[PDB]
Write a protein that binds this ligand. Structure first.
Ligand SMILES: [Cu+2]
Ligand SMILES: [Cu+2]
Ligand SMILES: [Cu+2]
Ligand SMILES: [Cu+2]
Ligand SMILES: [Cu+2]
Ligand SMILES: [Cu+2]
Lengths: 273, 273, 273
């Protein structure tokens, strides 16, 4: 129940659209950052190693109870910081750099998801056959604060982060989850752990060709909805969603705010017999 | 049991604002399209007859479980296509054309609502005196993909679709439901089946002069809220909302995102003794 | 109980950003307006005295059942009007000027919150140690209808309104709740009564360093969520949110739509031993 987690902050080139490279600010060389998974009640001992020689970075986990001005503080270039705090609430939480201006650090790529598994799981656990994590984020004009604050996103994208060995692990880009769809089998109930990290947009989350059997808002098992076509996610908003795929084919996964879908936010689930 | 539905795709001029005609892409000569009502558990046998001589069109019902790559496929100009799928979930679901670019087809007018009536209705059925269906959509600069992707809506609008003969059946425009308000009587509980089809905006749905006694998110009877002033609808989001009108007068119906209201999204409800 | 409330409509200079003065349209010389607090079941006898010499004004309370065309009607310059209506529903409700164009009156500053206390309070009343009221609003280019309808907000801001002597009572501005943080003590469970009055944006409401233990949507005790990281508020949407601060320090309060936080929407909560 004491968990020890280490990440680096670094600058990494990410191909966010075909032929379009963004010099992203990242945790562990991915944007969004690596998945973190803990159990409800765990105490996290988190170390951030700042490998950006130019600017400070920090870590804010939405899962934890912490003092932001003591526990989410900036770690200087080529220094490390270690912070300890509990994850007392089950669900699907955003994490991100909390260095001012926070919009600048998030928009440049410093966001991710931490999942906190509920003590007694979900009441539909037994029904689920397969699970994946999906994250939505936006990309803007490169490190352009005016665009971050006042412009529309250049791209809106999905990525998937591995829950277990063999799961895809991808970055937020307009194509990878079209070219290499997530995989499932006919008749399966799929669970997706989803978070919209923004920075700026809300998400109207919809899987084409199915209906969500069960939805747990922010992944807290108490927040139970049934039979939703589309799940409204605020910026930083999470959910656990579950649905059945009844026939073979490819099922798009979108935000239904179609300007964002048009700008990259469509992932594919390939369902085979 | 088995329901057979035939609709056409065609181009239809729609006066979306006073003296402003939009050459809309439509189902059945209306934008949004005609209301479709079925019962929970029905199998739908849907035929789309494409009467557009230039562009393919298709049909995605949010109500159904289907293989999108087999059952939501394009129907070529001057052809028909028939697809069969179940509607196993109660609620107020969006439908729309699913032809790429989907944003273009939705924005041009190819959207609508299908209601799936719950097996046992709603726990508040006995309390309801009167019902209407309202849909919110946006209009952009005519068939302008840059405007669709990056621009603000030119108009945001409500329409009503007839559940009963002599309910109003209108298109998405800025003026019809102001000039010809919906009708009700003092003391009645009113139910609205509502959906925000977008394409791009979320909706903050509010009836002036009342509070929603009961709300069922996406029209599923299990998703029950009470005493809401305003209902957040994602793009494609639906609800069943119920409220009492206590006094004679005219009650505006709005999205409380007032930029949208100002750009046309105000309908009126005239309540008389 | 019969409650008698009076406010004046007037023009008031407000420093919405450091060194930036907005000639606001206001209730009682504040924007947002003064807090109103009543009990569920109260009959409100409200008088508006319009001291604007040129423009009519009005009052629409989301809390009440009323005829908008009789009870929310315009009051002419230098005149008064008195209107009587019940507040039958518990929660945190927006109020605002209902004079056309409503977008202009809201955007210029004529918005506020009325709290309706539930007849039997909230099931978590016993756990709550301290309470505050926070309101989110936007500001645009001064009285510029094109910007109101089509532009991004220039500032997005929080204000606090007083429940008791010593509670901050502030205007919507970019700085006051940063310079003068809300106060709390380590270990306290804090209740916030919150409303996003818009006019145009939704809000992704989040307290940094904590998780909401309980959330009551629109402040109705029945609309109960648990363990939310972030609360989605439509334009005009309210909530009662409760959270624990476990450690000393300063905790930012944000909308997590970070373009808006960047443009002013960050308040501070300073937690001491
Ligand atoms: Cu950073
Ligand atoms: Cu955050
Ligand atoms: Cu089409
Ligand atoms: Cu759809
Ligand atoms: Cu006014
Ligand atoms: Cu209002």
């Amino acid at each position: 129940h004491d968990v020890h987690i280490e990440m680096t902050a670094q600058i990494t080139d990410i191909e966010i659209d075909k032929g379009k490279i963004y010099k992203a600010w990242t945790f562990n060389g991915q944007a969004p950052g690596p998945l973190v998974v803990v159990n409800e009640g765990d105490t996290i001992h988190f170390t951030l190693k700042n490998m950006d020689p130019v600017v400070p970075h920090s870590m804010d986990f939405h899962a934890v109870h912490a003092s932001p001005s003591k526990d989410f503080i900036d770690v200087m270039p080529n220094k490390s910081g270690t912070f300890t705090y509990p994850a007392n609430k089950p669900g699907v939480f955003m994490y991100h750099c909390g260095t001012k201006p926070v919009l600048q650090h998030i928009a440049n790529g410093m966001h991710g998801v931490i999942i906190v598994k509920p003590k007694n799981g979900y009441p539909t656990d037994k029904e689920v056959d397969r699970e994946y994590v999906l994250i939505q984020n936006e990309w803007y004009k490169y490190n352009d604060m005016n665009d971050f604050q006042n412009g529309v996103p250049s791209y809106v994208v999905f990525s998937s982060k591995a829950l277990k060995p063999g799961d895809p692990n991808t970055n937020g880009d307009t194509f990878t989850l079209k070219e290499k769809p997530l995989l499932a089998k006919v008749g399966e109930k799929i669970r997706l752990y989803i978070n919209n990290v923004g920075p700026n947009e809300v998400s109207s989350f919809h899987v084409v060709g199915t209906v969500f059997d069960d939805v747990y808002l922010d992944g807290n098992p108490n927040n139970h909805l049934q039979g939703m076509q589309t799940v409204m996610l605020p910026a930083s908003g999470g959910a656990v969603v579950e649905f059945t795929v009844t026939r073979p084919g490819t099922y798009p996964i979108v935000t239904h705010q179609f300007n964002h879908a048009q700008k990259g936010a469509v992932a594919m689930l390939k369902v085979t017999e």
